[PDB]
Structures are given as structure tokens and as C-alpha cells.
Design a protein around this ligand. Sequence first.
Ligand SMILES: CC(C)=CCC/C(C)=C\CC/C(C)=C/CC/C(C)=C/CC/C(C)=C/CC/C(C)=C/CC/C(C)=C/CC/C(C)=C/CC/C(C)=C\CC1=C(C)C(=O)c2ccccc2C1=O
Ligand SMILES: CCCCCCCCCCCCCCCC(=O)O[C@H](COC(=O)CCCCCCC[C@@H](C)CCCCCCCCC)COP(=O)(O)O[C@H]1[C@H](O)[C@H](O)[C@H](O)[C@@H](O)[C@@H]1O
Ligand SMILES: CCCCCCCC/C=C\CCCCCCCC(=O)OC[C@H](COP(=O)(O)OCCN)OC(=O)CCCCCCCCCCCCCCC
Ligand SMILES: CCCCCCCC/C=C\CCCCCCCC(=O)OC[C@H](COP(=O)(O)OCCN)OC(=O)CCCCCCCCCCCCCCC
Ligand code: HEM
Lengths: 79, 535, 139, 145, 92, 203
Amino acid sequence: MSTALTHGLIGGVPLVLFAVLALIFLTRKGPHPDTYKMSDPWTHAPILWAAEEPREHGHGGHGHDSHGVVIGGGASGKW
Amino acid sequence: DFAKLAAAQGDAIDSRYHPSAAVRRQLNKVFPTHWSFLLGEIALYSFIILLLTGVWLTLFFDPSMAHVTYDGVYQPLRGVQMSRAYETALDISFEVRGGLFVRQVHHWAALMFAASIMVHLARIFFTGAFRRPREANWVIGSLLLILAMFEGFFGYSLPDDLLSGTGIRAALSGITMGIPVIGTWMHWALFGGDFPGEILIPRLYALHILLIPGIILALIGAHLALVWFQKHTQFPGPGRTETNVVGVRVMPVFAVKSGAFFAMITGVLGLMGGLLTINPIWNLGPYKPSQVSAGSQPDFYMMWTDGLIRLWPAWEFYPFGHTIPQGVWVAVGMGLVFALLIAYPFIEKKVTGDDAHHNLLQRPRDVPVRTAIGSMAIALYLLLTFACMNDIIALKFHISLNATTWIGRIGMVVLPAIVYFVAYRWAISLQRSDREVLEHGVETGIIKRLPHGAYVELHQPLGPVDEHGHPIPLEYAGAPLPKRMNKLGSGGAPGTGSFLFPDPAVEHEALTEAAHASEHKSLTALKEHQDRIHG
Amino acid sequence: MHIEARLFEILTAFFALAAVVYAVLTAMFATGGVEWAGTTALVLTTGLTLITGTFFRFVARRLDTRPEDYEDAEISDGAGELGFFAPHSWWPILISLSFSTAAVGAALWLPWLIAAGVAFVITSVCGLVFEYYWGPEKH
Amino acid sequence: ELDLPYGSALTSSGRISAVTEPGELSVHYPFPTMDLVVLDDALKYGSRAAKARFAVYIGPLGADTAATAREILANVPTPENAVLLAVSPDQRAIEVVYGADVKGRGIESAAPLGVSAAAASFKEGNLIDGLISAVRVMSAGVSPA
Amino acid sequence: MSSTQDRSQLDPEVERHTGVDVEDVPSAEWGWSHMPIGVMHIGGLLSAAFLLVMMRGNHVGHVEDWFLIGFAAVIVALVGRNWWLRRRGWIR
Amino acid sequence: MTSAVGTSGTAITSRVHSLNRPNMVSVGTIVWLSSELMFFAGLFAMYFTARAQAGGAWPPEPTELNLALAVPVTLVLIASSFTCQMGVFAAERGDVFGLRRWYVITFLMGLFFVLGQGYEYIHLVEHGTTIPGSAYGSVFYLATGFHGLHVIGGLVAFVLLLARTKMSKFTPAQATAAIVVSYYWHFVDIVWIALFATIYFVR
Ligand SMILES: CC(C)=CCC/C(C)=C\CC/C(C)=C/CC/C(C)=C/CC/C(C)=C/CC/C(C)=C/CC/C(C)=C/CC/C(C)=C/CC/C(C)=C\CC1=C(C)C(=O)c2ccccc2C1=O
Ligand SMILES: CCCCCCCCCCCCCCCC(=O)O[C@H](COC(=O)CCCCCCC[C@@H](C)CCCCCCCCC)COP(=O)(O)O[C@H]1[C@H](O)[C@H](O)[C@H](O)[C@@H](O)[C@@H]1O
Ligand SMILES: CCCCCCCC/C=C\CCCCCCCC(=O)OC[C@H](COP(=O)(O)OCCN)OC(=O)CCCCCCCCCCCCCCC
Ligand SMILES: CCCCCCCC/C=C\CCCCCCCC(=O)OC[C@H](COP(=O)(O)OCCN)OC(=O)CCCCCCCCCCCCCCC
Ligand code: HEM
């Protein structure tokens, strides 16, 4: 029945339903926290990030010891 | 008195000549004992067998297109017009005792010669046995491979046959005559006129028994002399450096094992000449331009050229009042293949920048880009080789002939890329496996920790162990690492009695203790030599 | 292994009952007597579970209560040397490929590709089995 | 001693087996996943050239900013060759600290450059972009040992 | 235990300071390990072009042309994805 | 590498300590044999359906079973099972060479059984009955020849295990391997007893 009508239906109804469901669901606030604004106070706990970039002797924790902080300079700034 | 005779002959040799120093140098020359270094010896031995069988075949073969009715012994071909070449090939097969065996082992030796040349080329390319030194050795080896290919091409074409004559008509005639500026001129000068010219087989006979084999012998002499005096390179190892050769001396061990390997290779070739049928020319009727079969393939070494012919998509150009047939495409493709193969070491050095004198091979995993390129090239070669066989592949494995042709056409640009990517990543992952073994030790059976339910594989470090459990990671040294305690001193001392019955405990203990002492001595000698060299 | 054996014992009881009732109700009340296919299949699946359960019961009587079987078993009780579990190995893929080359040889009736797939399978099974027993190369 | 408010328990070994409610996350970082990925890319391979562990500390570093920077650097896994950039927006302060092995490799010259990039980006109003810019500048400045 | 560690000094000679690094290819110093990405991108583009060009031929068939189109399309898609990701710094 | 991080004298050992625990290899082998029982159950179903649909004379007129050659082969298979169990006892002990002797004679007798089955196959084929020739011929050949393939697999397992014992020192791992190979051989001989009682006696 109406070959063109059937083809258009099978090709479009899935698309229309997909669009509707995407509008319903993909347009909902996710669980990811919103980006931190500079004006707002820093509420999150301290965040220390490290590269894990170089090789660290052996993976074994023991034997690393604590040679020292061995500071090697400094800097400062105020935005 | 054999000892007296030997001493007297040695004195006579050293008095007539003075070969003591040179002979001692040859006997003391050290050769690495890696199996992959026997791949060239396979080709050399197959070449020797080829020569020995070819002399026998020449004693009975008559090259000529002079037409003759068979009137021989093979009934299914009697009274049929055939050339003297075909008639005498049939005579070798049937009316000469052992002639069928000799020609079959000759053809099998040719196939093994090509295959072992290909495997040796793979070995050297993947291990980098061509860079800075030995690059000219690689060049002449490439020439040798090309000569071997065309030598086999003329060989299986020598007995004027339906299959081989059809192959000649395709390649030698069509490709030669399609070449634009001088194609017909080369065709007429090779064939002494039109395709069935009465001198083709005599000319190929000369080329195949004297000219090309003479050049192959000269180039093999140059190859072996270069390997001999440019001491064989070796894989990185305990005592192996760029300025030494660790292995076994020529006289006691290397010579005997090389001779034994020659014996075993010729035994394999003879067994296959007996048990497996190669080129049944009696089944393949005499060449006639009007007759043809469906197979129509060349030997596996020319199968890639034939597959290129099949796959290339019928692109022809017609300049002003002229034609440029599709044969020129495949001719230029072969030219490019050979040029790239011959010039790879120089291409590689130009690209990377390494002109350092390299005597230590590099594992194919340690060179991801080159192993990837070699895998890509081998994939393309296999694609072409199976494209040439698409007829029988389609026939037996039920796949439409058009489907096989287009699978080849698409793959020859898709499959090389896939294999390149896969081989590159595979090499890098082999490197990663080596590094993990270096930094964690070999893997073993799992153990459940006492207090808690932790599971730990209970590795075994390959180097000094830190004060705590974890070891000090070692640095990769370009040499294979043992990834199974199987291959280390772990569970390797079965009762040394026999397969059916034991031996006395005293004898078993003596034998095993002596073996362990010998292993300790060998490892200590290697360790001390390594320390002395690097310290 | 009491529960492990009793599971198969229960399966054996049920499958034996099913085989017996099927055989009886097919010998009588069927169009052509015993079906002889379902009957045999039920009898030999009863045999399957019977073999497994008998072995499990033998082992249960042969072994003292394992920590795994013992309720109130601490982790430390079972803590110890677990046996050899094969680490990385590339022999399984080769075995699969060899068996696939035998299977295609059987499908496309190619005795030569059957013969080679079987050779291939023998070689790869030998490799897998000898993987952790090939002593160090003796030169 | 006290584990997380709910569902986290100390295990037979040291590791703490923690849980999160089905609908919520664990990291809770207040930055887009893509920008976190970009910063991680920087710290990971844009610093590989420096061959010195580059670290970022967004937390608040109060009291003597310099000294708190020193000890949070000490908390870095390998302070010997490390470069810690600490930003406290609660104090609008930047502090960069370096390890002894990270000396004379252009780090000291790059210090003002990295701090200036971070400050410029922050006054523009992009904490994460400033952190990335500072990491890039400092990594470019620092030469491998 | 019945294994001796290996000491190797291979002659080196690009100096590898640019291109690939050991963290990415552990044996970078031991052999050719870096193929410029432009080479692979151009190779993929030319392979796709060759596949498309093979459509022009003496074949009355059409599934052949469609297979060529599909394979060229996936090759071009892979090349474009790689180029875009590297342009943006391996994002998305 | 001081001595070893894994304090074991065998790179490969028993997958669990079998004295207090079940042998995993044995458990897996028993389960797989119980599955092969169902494979042979399918074959038996085929044979029994053909038997039921036969018109009274189950072995057609052309076919005639040769008990003279079928009784010696089954007796030899039973003897092979007994020798395999003796080899199992040797393996339970540390008797590497006793296990090797017992398994070698078991392999020889299994090969004799295979050759006898092949001889009976040749005789039967010569005297008419064939796989395509008749339904009886086909079901009989499928059943008995699949069993023969299983026997060949057992022979391969025997030679392979013997090679393993040659190449590595005898340990509980190899003892368990011998035990499971013997389990396979016993299953093979049991299914042969079933097939013999069905084909020849029950008919
Ligand atoms: C019906 C019919 C006609 C049937 C016959 C078929 C036919 C026509 C021909 C085949 C018949 C024959 C004659 C077959 C046997 C061929 C033959 C000579 C086999 C020899 C192998 C053999 C019998 C070994 C016995 C075992 C044993 C005690 C061995 C140690 C003593 C021996 C024989 C040592 C031989 C050493 C050897 C192979 C020397 C080859 C000489 C040549 C050409 C090169 C030497 C050479 C080698 C070998 C290198 O590997 C190499 C590597 C790197 C750089 C340089 C070299 C180099 O110069
Ligand atoms: C070395 C091998 C590896 C190659 C790697 C490259 C991978 C890319 C493969 C490209 C596949 C191209 C397939 C298309 C090709 C094409 O264009 O041809 C068609 C036929 O389509 C097809 O089946 C398509 C089948 C595609 C399956 C490809 C399978 C890949 C396998 C080979 C991979 C395994 C490799 C094993 C490696 C072994 C390792 C050895 C060490 C139509 O022919 P035709 O039959 O005349 O159809 C007529 C109608 O059209 C018409 O309406 C109607 O009227 C009729 O006339 C009808 O006949
Ligand atoms: C079956 C497969 C087909 C058969 C395959 C065998 C043929 C040979 C294989 C591959 C050749 C192409 C290699 C890749 C070439 C690299 C291009 C490049 O961009 O140059 C970079 C380099 C690194 O320099 P770098 O200081 O390490 O800096 C790092 C920068 N990222 O520069 C250079 O020195 C070199 C610049 C010029 C190189 C010219 C090489 C080709 C010469 C003509 C021969 C024909 C080639 C045929 C190609 C198939
Ligand atoms: C996911 C896609 C899913 C696509 C799935 C579709 C499957 C349906 C295919 C065949 C069904 C049986 C029909 C069999 C007969 C064919 C139909 C027909 O007649 O269609 C008209 C003309 C030819 O006219 P002709 O009279 O045949 O004569 C001609 C010369 N004499 O073709 C056309 O324009 C229309 C094209 C018809 C088929 C082309 C399909 C080939 C491959 C598609 C892409 C491969 C992608 C590879 C990716 C790496
Ligand atoms: C150098 C490498 C060589 C290769 C790869 C090679 C290859 C072949 C092959 C494949 C054949 C076909 C045999 C057949 O179809 O039965 C053949 C034939 C022949 N070869 Fe060679 N050959 C080589 C060297 C030689 C040598 C050195 C001689 C002479 C000493 C020779 C003499 C002959 C003769 C007379 C025939 C004709 C035999 C026939 O028609 O059956 N060949 N060759």
C-alpha cells in the first residue's frame, strides 16, 4: 500500500521517535558537577594532580624511603 | 697407518704450498649458532642439488621446436605432433630409469630454492642484516633472487608444454610486445620473430643451463665470500658485541652441522621428489596455441607477477595512433618491485639516518616500522600469489571468480594497510611484553597471601632483587627474555635412565651433576667474558 | 564436595526417572513403540550426570571438608599455595585456527585440507601441552 | 579514624573498599571531562619533554603560601624532580615550587612565564585553561635532565 | 636462575630526540620506530583514491563499484578521524 | 634470582594440592568425558532408530558381522584398559619408567585394536556393506568409526603424554596428566563395551 508512504514511514518514524527521545533524555542535567566559577568560593576539597610521567625506580613501595623535600626554587602571583 | 699417511700428506701440502696460517684462520673462524642463519644455507644446498640434477637432465634433454610424432612409450600421447623438447621430456619421464624422479626432485629443488631465498630475505630484512655493512651483500642477494625467479621461469618452461607454453605466451610474449617504444622489437629479438619462433626453447635452454646459472654461481660465490670475510652478524646476547663473533668454530662443530644439514635438506628434497608429483608434463599435453587449461599458473615464485597481471584493472591508454596495453602496467610494477627491493637498505638509511657500522642484528619487534613494512610487503605478496590462484581457489573453495578477482583488487590496497597497522602494533606490544618481563620477572603459578585473600602470581625476578620483594628492574639489551620458568632451571631433570627402564642411581646422579656443572661453567664463562668486555 | 556431588545425584535421579517414564510411555501409547532417539538420549544424559556425580561423590568421600565447603571458614584457612594457572599463551588461537582449517576441509569436501588441518591440530595441541614442559635448549 | 560517611570499610589489607550511591559519581571534580582530559594530556605528554613530574594543586594553600606550597610539593610522589603549580582562588594566589633536580634546566626562567600565563587566564576567568597554559609554558621552558 | 643478563652496545646514528619516545615505543633507540603521520594519512587518502578510481573499468557489474565506494569511504573516514583528533590534540 | 621468588622445583605443578583438594584436571576431564558420552548418545540414537525401522532382519543380507575378529579386538581393548590402570598406579607412584612401560604397551594394544577395526572395515566393505551401501552399514560405520577416531585421539594423547614425561621431570602435574589420559582411555573402552554389546550381541 502506497510504496512511497510505507518507505517514508519506516524511514521517518524511527527518526522522529529518536529525535523526541533525545530531546527528552539527552537534554537533562547530567551527574557531572558544573564547572567551578572563579567568583564562587572554592568548596571542593584540595586537589593535587600529578603526571605519572617519568619512570619511578621500581613499582614496589618499600625501598623508596624519604630522601627529603629538596626544594628547588619558588614563584608567586596574584592573578 | 692412516695417521702416518695423514701426517705425511699434511707435510707434503705444507711443503708444496704454505696454507697453514690460512687454513687455521678458516678453521678458527667463528660462526653464530642461530637457526635463522641456516636459512641461506638451505638455499645454497637446494642450489647444489639443482646443479647436480640439472647436469643429469641435460644429459637427456633435447631443446627444439622441431615437430615430431611421439611414437614413444606413453600411450595417451601417441602420433600427436609435439616438439623435440616435449618428446625428450617425456623420454626422461618414462623411457629413462629414474628420469622421472630426477626431474621431479629437480623441480622440487627449484621450488625449495625459491622458497628458501624468500625466507632468507625475510630473515635478513627483519633482523636488519643489510644496514651499513652488508648492504652490497643485500643488493647482490636481491639480484640473485630475481635471477632465481627467472631461472625457474625458464626451467619449467623448458619442456615445451601446454601449461608452461601458455605461461610463456602470456608473460614473455604479451608483456614484452606491449611495451610502448621497443616492445615488439624486444619480442622479435628474443623470439627470433613471431611468438612460436623456432629458436625460443634453444635460447631458453642456453640461458637456463649455462648463462643464468653461471651468473647465479658467480653471485653466490660473491655472496658467500662477503659473508665469510665480513664476519656474520649476530643477535644481541650475553657476550655478543659489535666487535666480536660469539658462536662455534668452523672445524669441529659448524662444519659437521652444516654438512649434516645439507644431508637432511637433500633428503627432504629426495623424499618429496619421490612421494609428491611435480609438473606431470605427460598429463599436460604438448603446447598448441589453440589449446589451454583452466589452471594456467606459473610456479609460486612467479605467481605474484601473474596475480598482478590478473588484478590490475584493465587500464589501457591510446596515444596518437598507438596503444599502451595493460601489460606495461605489470611490467612497470615488477620494475618498481625489484628497484625497491634492491635499493631498500639505501632507502632505509636515507630515511632513518643510520649509517653506523651495524654488526649486531635487531629483533624485528625492536624495529616496529621496518617489521611493519616487511609485514605489509609480505601481505601484498601473499595477496598477489593467491590472486594468481584465484581460479583454483574459486573452484575448490566455492567463491565466485569475479568475487575473488575483486577481493584481490580491493585487498591489494586494503590488506597491506591492515597488516602494516597490525604488525606495527604487534611489534610495539612485543616490546611492552619484554619490558613487563624485565621489570616484574617471569610469571608463574598463583598464590593466596596468608593473612588476606590477595592473589599474587608469584613472579620470578631475572635480576638482583631489592631488599623487599619487588626486584630492581633490568634494562632491555636487545636480546630475547625467558617468559616461562619452563625454559629456566625449573622442572627439567627427568630420570636419565631410558624411555622404558631406569639407570642405576649412581650413574644418574653422576650424569645430572656433570650436566649441571657444565651449565654452570658455560654460564660463568659467558658472564666473565661479558664483564671483561664491558669492564 | 557434598553439595557438588548431590547436585549431580539429584540430576541423575530426575533424568533416570524421565528416561524410564519416557521409555515406558513410548513402548506403550506411542504410534510406533519406543522412540529409540529420545529414550537413548535421556538414558545417556542420565549416564552423563551419573558419571559426574559418582566421581564427585568419590572425591567428597576421599577429601576432608575443604575450607570452601566449610561454613565459618576464615580466609586464612584457605590462604596458601594455589597451583599452576597457565599465564599468557598464544597456543589456543593456533589450535582454534587448525581446527577451523580441518572444519572447512570437512565442509568443503577437501581431503587434503582435512589432512592438513588435522596435522595442524596435532602440532598446536602438542605445542599447548608441551608449552610448560619444553626444557631449556641444550645446544 | 573514620571511613567515608557511608558504605566505605577498611578491608583485611590496607585498601579501603568504598562505595557510591548508584546515581552519583566518585571524582566529583568541578570541571568538564574534556577540559580535565586536556589538562591530563598536558601533564602527561606535554611534560614528557621536561622529564620532571609536573603537578597541579587547585586546593587552598593558606597561611604562608610559599611554605604550604613547599610541603604540598613534598607530598608529590617524586619531589626530587618535580614542578608543582598551586592555585588558590579563595586567595587568588599562585605558587610554583621545584625540586632540587629541577634546577638550571630553564625552570627558573620559565617560572615567571608560567605564573604570568596562569594569572592572565585566571583574570580572564578560566582556572583550568590557565592551569593548562601554565603547564605548557613550563614544560616548554624545562629541558630534560 | 640458569640465565645471564645481556650487555649490549649497538652503534647509534635523526638522533630520536624528536619523533617517538621510549614511553610510547619502548625500543625507540633500538631501531626505526616512527613513521611520520603525514605519510600514513597521504597513503590512506591515495588508497581510497585508487579504490574509487578502480570503479572506472571494463566491468558491467555494480556491486563491485559499491564495494569500492564503501572501502574508500571507511578509509577516508579513518584518515579524517585521525587527522581531526591529532589536530585537536587527541580529543573526542 | 637469589634462589627463586617462586619456591617450586617445577615450572608447572598441580593446579591445586590434590591431597586435601579435588584435582581440577581430573574434574574437568571427567566432565568432558561425560559430555563425550552424550556425543556417543547421539550416535546410539541414530543406530537405534535405524534398527527400529529395519524390517526384521536388522543386519541386511549382504552384511555379516565377524565375531571372530570382533571378540579379540574388544578383549585387547579391555587388556589395554587394565594396562592403562597399571600405568596409572605407576604414575601415582614416582615410577616414571613404569608408567612409560605400561602406557607404551597400552598404546601398542590400542593401535592393534585400531588396526583390527580397520581390517574388519576392509572385510565388510569388500563383502558389500558400505556407508552409502545401506542404512545398517552407515549407522554401524558412523558409530564404530567415530569410536575409532576417539581411540586414535587416545593414542595421540598417549604418545603426547609420553613425550611430555620424556622432556620434563615427573611431578604431580605429569602424574595427574597420566591419570586424566587414563580416564579418557577407560571411557573409550567403556563406550566400546556398550557398542560391542549393542552391535554384535543385542543386534
Ligand atoms: C636417480 C638419481 C640420479 C638420484 C640422485 C639425484 C641427483 C641427480 C643428485 C643428488 C645425489 C647426491 C650426490 C646427494 C648428496 C649431496 C651431498 C654432497 C650431500 C653431502 C651431505 C652429507 C653426505 C653429509 C654426511 C654427514 C657428515 C659427516 C657431514 C660432515 C662432513 C661434510 C660432508 C661436510 C660438508 C660441508 C659442506 C656442505 C660444504 C659445501 C661447500 C660449499 C658450496 C660452500 C661452503 C659454505 C657453507 C656450507 C656455508 O654455510 C657458508 C655460510 C656463510 C659463508 C660461507 C659459507 C660457505 O662457504
Ligand atoms: C588474501 C585474502 C584477504 C583479502 C583482504 C582484503 C579484504 C577486502 C575484501 C574485499 C571484498 C570485495 C567483495 C566484492 C567482490 C565483487 O565485486 O564481486 C561480487 C561478489 O560479491 C561477494 O560475494 C563479496 C564477498 C566479499 C567477501 C570477502 C571475504 C574475505 C576473505 C577472503 C578473508 C579471508 C582471508 C583468508 C586468509 C588466508 C591466509 C593464508 C595464509 C559480485 O560478483 P558476482 O558473483 O558476479 O555477482 C553477480 C551479481 O552482482 C548480479 O546482480 C547477479 O545477476 C549475478 O550475476 C551475480 O553473479
Ligand atoms: C608494500 C609497501 C611498498 C614497499 C615498501 C619499501 C619501500 C621503502 C619503504 C618506505 C619509504 C617511506 C618511508 C617514510 C618517509 C618519511 C617522510 C618524511 O616526512 O621524512 C621524515 C624522515 C625522518 O626524518 P627525522 O629527522 O627522523 O624527523 C622526523 C619527522 N617526523 O626524514 C628523512 O630523513 C627522509 C626524507 C626523504 C625520504 C625519502 C624515502 C623514499 C625515497 C624514494 C623511494 C620510493 C619510496 C616508495 C614508497 C612506498
Ligand atoms: C551496509 C550496506 C547494506 C546494503 C544491502 C543491500 C543488499 C541488496 C543487494 C542485492 C539484492 C538482490 C538483487 C540482485 C540484482 C541487483 C539489483 C539491481 O538490479 O539494481 C539495479 C542496478 C543494477 O542493475 P542489474 O539489473 O543488476 O544489472 C547490472 C548490469 N547488468 O544497481 C543499482 O543501481 C542499485 C544497487 C544494487 C546492489 C548494490 C549492492 C552492493 C554493495 C553495497 C556496499 C558495500 C559496502 C562495503 C563496505 C566496506
Ligand atoms: C639455478 C637454479 C635453477 C632453477 C631454479 C631451476 C629450475 C628448473 C625447473 C623448475 C625446471 C622444470 C623441471 C620439470 O618441469 O620437470 C627445470 C628444468 C631443467 N633444468 Fe633447471 N634450474 C636451475 C638450474 C639448472 C642447472 C644448473 C642446470 C644444468 C646443469 C639445469 C638444467 C635443467 C634442464 C636440462 C631442465 C629440463 C628438464 C625437463 O625438461 O624436465 N637447471 N629447471
